[PDB]
Amino acid sequence: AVPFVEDWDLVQTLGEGAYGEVQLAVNRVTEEAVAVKIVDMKRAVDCPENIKKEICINKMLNHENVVKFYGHRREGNIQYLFLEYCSGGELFDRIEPDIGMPEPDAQRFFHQLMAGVVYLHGIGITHRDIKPENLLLDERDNLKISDFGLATVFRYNNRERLLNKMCGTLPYVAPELLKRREFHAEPVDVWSCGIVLTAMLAGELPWDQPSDSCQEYSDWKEKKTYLNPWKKIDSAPLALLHKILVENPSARITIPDIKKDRWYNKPLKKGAKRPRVTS
Ligand SMILES: CN(C)CCOc1ccc(-c2cc(C(N)=O)c(NC(N)=O)s2)cc1
Numbered sequence: 210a211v212p213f214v215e216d217w218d219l220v221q222t223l224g225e226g227a228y229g230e231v232q233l234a235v236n237r238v239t240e241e242a243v244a245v246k247i248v249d250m251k252r253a254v255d256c257p258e259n260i261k262k263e264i265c266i267n268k269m270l271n272h273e274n275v276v277k278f279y280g281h282r283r284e285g286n287i288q289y290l291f292l293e294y295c296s297g298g299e300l301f302d303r304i305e306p307d308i309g310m311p312e313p314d315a316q317r318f319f320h321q322l323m324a325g326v327v328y329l330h331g332i333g334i335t336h337r338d339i340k341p342e343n344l345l346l347d348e349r350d351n352l353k354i355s356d357f358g359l360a361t362v363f364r365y366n367n368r369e370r371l372l373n374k375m376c377g378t379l380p381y382v383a384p385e386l387l388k389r390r391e392f393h394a395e396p397v398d399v400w401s402c403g404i405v406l407t408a409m410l411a412g413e414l415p416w417d418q419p420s421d422s423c424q425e426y427s428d429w430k431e432k433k434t435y436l437n438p439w440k441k442i443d444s445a446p447l448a449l450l451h452k453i454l455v456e457n458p459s460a461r462i463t464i465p466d467i468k469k470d471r472w473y474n475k476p477l478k479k480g481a482k483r484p485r486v487t488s
Pocket residue numbers: 223224225231244276292293294295296297298299345355
């Protein structure tokens with residue numbers, strides 16, 4: 210009934226890339242801020258199919274640590290995806306090069322990342338490109354898993370589908386994607402979460418890619434943790450990383466066991482500061 214309430218002004222570019230762009234949209238009437246992913250379907254032959262899959266997966270998602278999907282509008286060859294706006298930006302920009310961040314902050318973000326990944330895996334979705342660029346933060350520094358353009362179904366009608374598509378981002382990708390024809394979905398996401406944890410605690414990525422040809426990866430398998438980035442990481446979280454960054458995906462720690470890890474459960478981080486006064 211209220212005129213103008215479906216009008217949104219696009220006021221700022223939030224991100225850009227080959228896929229298209231993300232704009233900050235502000236409602237003309239209510240001033241509600243949302244993110245709008247704008248995709249030109251003529252930019253590639255199979256974009257219509259790709260974006261349709263992304264939209265289908267987005268419609269499945271309802272969790273506090275996953276970017277919420279509000280809907281989409283098509284206008285000719287342009288698709289507009291309306292998404293939860295995360296005003297804290299990328300987790301990437303909270304990681305100080307060569308330093309990382311305070312361990313308690315890293316632990317809190319890691320808890321929230323695990324919550325989001327448990328949720329996705331529970332509904333049979335794998336993200337396939339977990340990295341700090343795809344982990345956004347709201348106004349209270351709550352982590353939100355973002356961008357389902359590479360996501361897929363790995364479990365349907367209680368039957369698991371093995372994956373074979375080589376995809377993701379090399380520094381974050383699990384070794385089995387480079388070594389094996391087929392692989393289970395869930396350990397691949399666990400691995401990339403481990404690389405994210407490494408980055409948060411050390412402010413550096415451990416290797417270009419997880420291959421024996423890569424000396425830093427070989428050093429890790431030889432347990433040379435007196436070298437960086439591992440030297441910078443305290444013994445408790447390093448013990449968790451030793452369980453996550455395991456080459457054999459069948460021996461790799463699962464999420465239910467990550468949740469029982471000593472460091473994962475160590476009291477470290479105070480709740481957000483709240484106003485007080487003394488008398
Ligand atoms: C703390 N900082 C210095 C000030 C804010 O900076 C921002 C805020 C939001 C974003 C954002 C980038 C993207 C994206 N690439 O998809 C967003 N998407 C979303 N669903 O909200 S928000 C990027 C940068």
